[PDB]
Symmetry: D2
Subunit: 213 residues, 4 copies
């Protein structure tokens, strides 16, 4: 049994809660009030930066060529993805400055600090595992609700969700999983706790997005 499948198995109860979270459900169904979505999208700036910080630390510690592959990903987050994000902000009548000036919630800061902290104290696999719930759950969620997406009345939501269903996104999850699954068999327990914590943060992030605070 591959490490990644084990992690998914041991965090099963939590992912079930992510899949059916009201924010997630309504976003994919199209019922989500645009304002709630805007609040979520503004909190995403901190998320994009945080993800980039943790990836920079992991790459700073990795062997070549992996460090090159990781740095490309970090670069894409604050480059290509920032452009897509600014483009999303436009559609919502918002600007990067609005995002930049948004105050991250405690959960937002906490989640990103958890990613950085794990990258700092842990080896390459531990750091990456702290980011897997993020990458993987976003793909699982869209797959889970794929049917509602086609029936979703809000063009902005359909465009947003289609990203996680794309082959490029899916290939990225595949790569991350592969790096982790091709590693040793020892220390699984540490990996399990890292993954679980990351999964709880995802659930908490969706919750704070819904509460608008």
């Amino acid at each position: 049994v591959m490490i990644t499948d084990k992690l998914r198995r041991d965090s099963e109860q939590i992912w079930k809660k992510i899949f059916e979270h009201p924010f997630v459900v309504q976003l994919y169904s199209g019922t989500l009030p645009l304002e709630k979505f805007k609040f979520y999208v503004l909190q995403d700036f901190n998320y994009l930066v945080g993800l980039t910080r943790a990836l920079a630390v992991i790459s700073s510690k990795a062997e070549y060529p992996l460090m090159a592959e990781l740095i490309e990903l970090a670069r894409d987050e604050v480059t290509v993805e920032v452009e897509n994000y600014v483009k999303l902000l436009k559609e919502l009548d918002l600007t990067l400055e609005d995002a930049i000036k948004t105050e991250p919630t405690l959960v937002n800061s906490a989640y990103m600090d958890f990613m950085l902290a794990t990258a700092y104290k842990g080896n390459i696999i531990e750091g990456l595992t702290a980011l897997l719930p993020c990458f993987w759950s976003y793909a699982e969620i869209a797959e889970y609700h794929k049917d509602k997406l086609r029936d979703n009345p809000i063009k902005i939501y359909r465009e947003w969700g289609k990203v996680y269903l794309s082959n490029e996104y899916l290939n990225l999850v595949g790569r991350l999983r592969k790096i982790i699954d091709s590693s040793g068999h020892s220390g699984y327990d540490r990996l399990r706790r890292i993954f679980i914590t990351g999964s709880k943060f995802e659930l908490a992030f969706w919750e704070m997005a819904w509460r608008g605070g």
Copy 2:
């Protein structure tokens, strides 16, 4: 106006919430069910270790003699304080192993990762500021409730609370504040955000301790 007094001022609404939190109030009054206290005390192990990790990082980056002073503090947490903690555990019919095997809540892990993460990306003053809510609020809380403490029927709670009223503890807070207050005038806003985040974590920690999860 000194940096530290400013931080206290800008996080005033939060600290009011900490002072009157049910866990805090009942602990100091003596009405706290022993079980809730035991749950809290078991979560303290992760807190002691996390505090030590963050201090280690801050010292690794500081100039001598401050690095020496900070490492002594880190050393004391995992040595002298572990002994006092084990002694507290005894009084509660618990063992270090019980503490070591306790699973930290998401808030616990989050708080410690915030401390480490801030120590890692920030300069010496930013790292220390991430720890000030911790050190300072524990002293302010006991001062605030000092009157109930002498009227507290539970010996274990009185012993626990007396620590934060002692001259040794108070001197430590004084030192920490001094280091921070003798620093530049620039970057106050980053310090403010760090302090606020740390204060919200304190409130969250008391809340999770009360909820037992």
Copy 3:
């Protein structure tokens, strides 16, 4: 009436930069007299440099505020992509492969210099981290400017291609930008910057020297 921080860094390291400008390896590389064998030893030692520069930039980036962080990760990214590609093309002209580079044992000097970069990025703020990298970026441009004439007249094509990179406007503008960042910082804490910059400058000299010694 106060000059800039980078003006002082150049000012305070003049003697060692002079030794760098006049180092046999450097002088011979730009004149075209360097024995092709010594250049290969140097190029080979460059892999570890390429990777090390990338590691340090990643750490500085991890601690920087946005948008500077993005500007820095882009530079780190280019070191290990665009530049690895160019490095491979250079290796080719010399009948060497990336494999040979990757397998090359870095001299003590090399390891040490890269460690100084990473260590400084880790313990200091971003200005201190970048200052640890300025001797690298800056001296390579100054060296080329210094031997500009000899280059435009160098018999060996590979050496010419190699050198021209540092005289380009893009490379010059990049170093300019790194200096702007350092110079727009606080007036205090100069002494720490000075020691960091001087250490980096010594490593640069040491690097040429070990490339000259072939060990």
Copy 4:
């Protein structure tokens, strides 16, 4: 039938450790022939070493699991407390003050070695970090063991006091413990450990050399 990891590290660095055991500075310090002036230059350069060893231990401890983290922070704490006190007493016997030490400019070799320690602690796991510190702790004990006889017969009291520290059971037990931690780790990844240990060993030799050169 497989020897231990630290057995291999000693095995793979035999030639440079021999040069360390036979280095003039080392040989003369233990025989009692070293000119007191050279010892002072060395002791002076030790402050930066004392601080650097402490920084690297702090980073390793910050990443370690409990209780190893506590064992390591204690060692870091002793470096900057008990040992600074001993170092001050030594400085005194030599008519020097901590102030003189703190104000001493560390040679490039010194800075580099400390940076290698910190950089290794930062990028690698705890075993790799500790392995970067083993040549330090271990070689000092082996050197004393190696020149044991010369020491018990050294004319200069300060040198004798200085040397005896490394023959004590406590010091020997500490190195023993550091080796036990490294040896109870995984069988794989040895090559990384080897390069780290060999780098550290070269720095040790370089350190004596710069102490001998006085620059």
